């Protein structure tokens, strides 16, 4: 019959606690449906106190009723606070040492510290038995973030592999003048080899032609470096890649076979959030 502190997509935390009450004007026999409270990690424990006081019967002493006092305890314990980040997933021990926490402690700070144990206590004044709520683990607090990071990193791959094929089907075509340059030399080889070893004319005649052709290829490269070859012609290569990245209407959500504003910095910005949460809980990720 233990309570829960659940995490939501937003920063809020939903608190399920089964109060043992219901046949009560004042609590000083079926219980009432467990209380579900929505709290923020930045509001103090005193606000969580007056939240539970509203969904609870008054406390009567003699002629007057008064709001019950609520005390939160945790297993907190030589000079370094032993953090585990396991929470309810921890090992548990026979009997634990509890300490009171100040009503000014923010719920977020109190929860991450109490994660050293498997549960934190909630005591309502006037009722002898204390309640138990299982502290969320580090993995619990980052469930929607991790599950969304897995979703982000998978759509990125469905979008990267089409930029991959777009950026590889643009090299076999752009390297056509490189293979043609090799064919020009090998064909020029065969002309020189044939005339020397299969023709009467000697090196007196062919060598100047090989020199005039050498200067021609040098000047051909000078007229080539006199185009967009100087500095970075990647702008011309980027235009061919941009034309190859045509839009596709295949998938309504996570559209396949297209390319645009790849927002990967949110997948990294989300990972920075999950790792910062692991550090304050004192764990690796």
């Amino acid at each position, epitope marked *: 019959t233990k309570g829960r502190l659940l995490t939501t997509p937003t920063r809020l935390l939903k608190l399920i606690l089964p109060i043992p009450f219901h046949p009560e004007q004042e609590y000083i026999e079926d219980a009432v449906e467990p209380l579900a409270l929505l709290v923020h990690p930045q509001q103090p424990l005193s606000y969580l106190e007056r939240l539970i006081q509203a969904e609870i019967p008054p406390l009567l002493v003699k002629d007057r009723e008064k709001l019950p006092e609520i005390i939160f305890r945790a297993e907190a314990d030589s000079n370094v606070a032993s953090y585990s980040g396991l929470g309810r997933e921890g090992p548990s021990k026979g009997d634990t040492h509890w300490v009171r926490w100040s009503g000014s402690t923010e719920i977020g700070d109190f929860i991450r510290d109490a994660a050293r144990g498997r549960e934190f206590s909630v005591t309502i004044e006037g009722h002898a038995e204390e309640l138990r709520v299982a502290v969320p683990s580090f993995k619990d607090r980052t469930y929607y973030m991790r599950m969304r990071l897995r979703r982000m990193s998978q759509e990125i791959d469905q979008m990267a592999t089409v930029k991959r094929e777009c950026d590889l089907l643009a090299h076999k075509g752009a390297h056509a003048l490189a293979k043609g340059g090799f064919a020009a030399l090998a064909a020029w080889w065969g002309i020189v080899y*044939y005339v*020397t*070893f*299969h*023709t*009467d004319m000697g090196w007196d005649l062919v060598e100047p032609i090989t020199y005039l052709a050498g200067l021609a290829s040098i000047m051909g490269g000078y007229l080539w470096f006199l185009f967009i070859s100087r500095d970075l012609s990647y702008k011309a290569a980027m235009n061919v890649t941009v034309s190859r990245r045509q839009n596709a209407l295949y998938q309504e959500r996570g559209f396949d076979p297209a390319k645009w504003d790849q927002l990967v910095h949110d997948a990294n910005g989300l990972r920075r959030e999950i790792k910062f949460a692991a550090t304050e809980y004192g764990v690796e990720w």
Partner: nanobody
């Protein structure tokens, strides 16, 4: 692809003779084409030869007296043999190689040259 020769015959010592051989069946121009002789009992010996990329050399007994000459247009080997002797007597053959593989691959029909004594 094979060669045929024509020009052999009889002539006495100190005479002259011109030898001709025509290569045919080649898609290209052959690299090497030369002349070889065969004494009545000895082996096939080298007389004269012209490799296009390589040398144009004669044999020792041949040097100074005969002249080999190729014309690649008509693809014909010529051997002008002057100052003949009885030791010049042999069956003369036409050998050709399409590529510079040192050795001999293609052979001709053969013409006899006789120098009496």
């Amino acid at each position: 692809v094979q060669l045929q020769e024509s020009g052999g015959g009889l002539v006495q010592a100190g005479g002259s003779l011109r030898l001709s051989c025509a290569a045919s069946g080649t898609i290209f121009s052959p690299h090497y084409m030369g002349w070889y002789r065969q004494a009545p009992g000895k082996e096939r010996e080298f007389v004269a030869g012209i490799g296009f990329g390589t040398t144009t050399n004669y044999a020792n007994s041949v040097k100074g007296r005969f002249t080999i000459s190729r014309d690649n247009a008509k693809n014909t080997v010529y051997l002008q043999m002057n100052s003949l002797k009885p030791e010049d007597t042999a069956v003369y053959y036409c050998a050709a190689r399409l590529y510079p593989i040192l050795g001999h691959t293609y052979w001709g029909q053969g013409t006899q040259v006789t120098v009496s004594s």
